[PDB]
Ligand binder design. Sequence first.
Ligand SMILES: Nc1nc2c(ncn2[C@@H]2O[C@H](COP(=O)(O)OP(=O)(O)OP(=O)(O)O)[C@@H](O)[C@H]2O)c(=O)[nH]1
Ligand SMILES: [Mg+2]
Ligand SMILES: [Mg+2]
Length: 182
Amino acid sequence: AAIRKKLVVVGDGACGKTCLLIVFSKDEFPEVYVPTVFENYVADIEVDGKQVELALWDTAGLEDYDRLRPLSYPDTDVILMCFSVDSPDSLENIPEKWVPEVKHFCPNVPIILVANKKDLRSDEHVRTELARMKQEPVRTDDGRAMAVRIQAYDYLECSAKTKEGVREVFETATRAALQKRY
Ligand SMILES: Nc1nc2c(ncn2[C@@H]2O[C@H](COP(=O)(O)OP(=O)(O)OP(=O)(O)O)[C@@H](O)[C@H]2O)c(=O)[nH]1
Ligand SMILES: [Mg+2]
Ligand SMILES: [Mg+2]
């Protein structure tokens, strides 16, 4: 008799949402990038002595699918709002697009702000490319500051590619889902 909770992930195209969900749920890292249209995966986790049957709702980051995405939002217990550290613009798009959308359709649902691809923070090619545009990989303090700005439940960083931090994202999201207030 496990408790069911619904998790929805949102954020810019190619920022790492599917790989995060599939590494967590299957311990596989998909090797070919296919933009998502709509999926709903199953997973299980135990948090604070509670066994949870998680539904993981994967959404399209591409704005081509903006009209379909809200079909995923009803009755959500926790949102993962993702950006990637190699893409400062993916962080800018958090307040520009993702926060207004989720506030419209998911009022009062806890949000975990998640920095994906943390393995790229030190990558020399990423650094070189961003420096040409007078940018840098997203710093932890800037991610945390965005989390405070947008009133997120928490801020966490991970790499689906190495698995660093992945378990903690889902433990914290599950705890947020369990404490959701009405
Ligand atoms: N270096 C690195 N690359 C990653 C990581 N996670 C995903 N990627 C790569 O980033 C690309 C996009 O990853 P996805 O997880 O498919 O991105 P998405 O956010 O689901 O994209 P949409 O479905 O189009 O919204 C792929 O080439 C992945 O292999 C990570 O942790 N580190
Ligand atoms: Mg995807
Ligand atoms: Mg670890």
